[PDB]
Amino acid sequence: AVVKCKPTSPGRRHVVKVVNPELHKGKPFAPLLEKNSKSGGRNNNGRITTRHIGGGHKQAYRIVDFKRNKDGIPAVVERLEYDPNRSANIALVLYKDGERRYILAPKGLKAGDQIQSGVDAAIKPGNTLPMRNIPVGSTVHNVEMKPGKGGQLARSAGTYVQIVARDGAYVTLRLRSGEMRKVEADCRATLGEVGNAEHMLRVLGKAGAARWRGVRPTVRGTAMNPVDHPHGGGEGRNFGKHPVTPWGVQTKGKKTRSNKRTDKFIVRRRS
Template sequence: MIILKINYNKKIGKNNTGHIVLRHRKKGKKSLYIPIDSNYFNHINNNNLCIRLLGETSNDMYRNTKLILCIITKDDGVKEFRYILKPNKKSYGDFIKFFDKTNKSFGDVNCLNSFDINDKVYNIEFKPLINSKICTAAECNSILLNKIKNYIKIKLPSNKIKQLNNKCYAVYGNSEKLIVNSINKAGTKMSFGNRPKVRGSAMNACDHPHGGGEGKAPIGKKSIYSFKGKKVKGIKTVKTKNDCYK
């Protein structure tokens, strides 16, 4: 049995003692969380497998992509319903194919070794038989560059090159973006869990390193400081030594 919707407690940026650790957060509007199937139906290896798409949901507050409900019928006649990321150019009644090398269409699932060079894929596994983690955002995809023995080099959206195993699963194309209405008032942002942001120079001296002074006073320092008192300008923030996408 697959649970389609569950309760989810949002993070409000406070620790166990009640102190604020991450600012500008609140609980926001209550909504159910929809877990998606990032394991490709437990890695089924049938060559003639097709999944039928049933309908889509567009009111998910936790993602910027559309979700679609799909159904699969196993050999023993048992049907399973799961939510997946909606492929672009796919709609109700269409099918998603597994391991089809001849006719590639958006949403088809296959191993990285079966795709051609310069193909665009998304929802990629970091390691074989592990949930997909790469390129899961809306309209996000990677490009296959080269095939070397049992490994394949792909180009990520950040222009970094990553070498993966050729047995990792991926989806052809990209996912469809969720269309959100324009933000006409502050309450729409508050419903998503965002609190208003205040300038540091408008605070008191006890609340921020830039605070204090009469009227519109300058910050009184040579460089910009963060809320915790650390330097912000001219400091390296990326550690390429420990970066997993190097």
């Protein structure tokens, strides 16, 4: 649920929290944990390649099964756990053969629900099937770009993909961005949407909240100096030039897609 903090002090006045009582209030599944060392936005050369990254709370990676290749073995949802590595929640599912795995939690999933994967699986939320068997017009998530590569599209808190048409060996999808893209009609997809739709309603409320996420402060650019940024300085605030990134690219409408290997699978771009 969405709850607004009382203004007992500055920094809590505008805080809006998303509290889920159904989430597991305990330690995660140790066998599926892994070490996740922070990088600070620096590559193997030691240089900052992506700015505004650093600090934040320590996190342990959860091995989420994006492939869902366990076919024909029913699984039962044990509990839903908070995942610090992604906006969406995850569910610990116990297969009937005694195996436990982590999967993205769909919208209407809760403890005790039954899920299955394979060609013969039922058309219910949480089930993963190849898009060939998925009825046209269905809502799916964790879509696979290539057969067997694992889900890659629509994995955010409340995102989903709609199957628009099936033309032979390909199916046309409408992504959350509005793009119309086609993929082979053999990729796996999970029914339903991701069930953390309230995630977008949270309000951090204070600067320190962003620092917890590991986001370092952003310096605008119009106020540093001519040497550091094209927007430069000037006596007072001038900014008398076209908006531009560092390194000199416009970025106020200028497009930067230059793949040319894809775009055979792109029907419409967006908007």
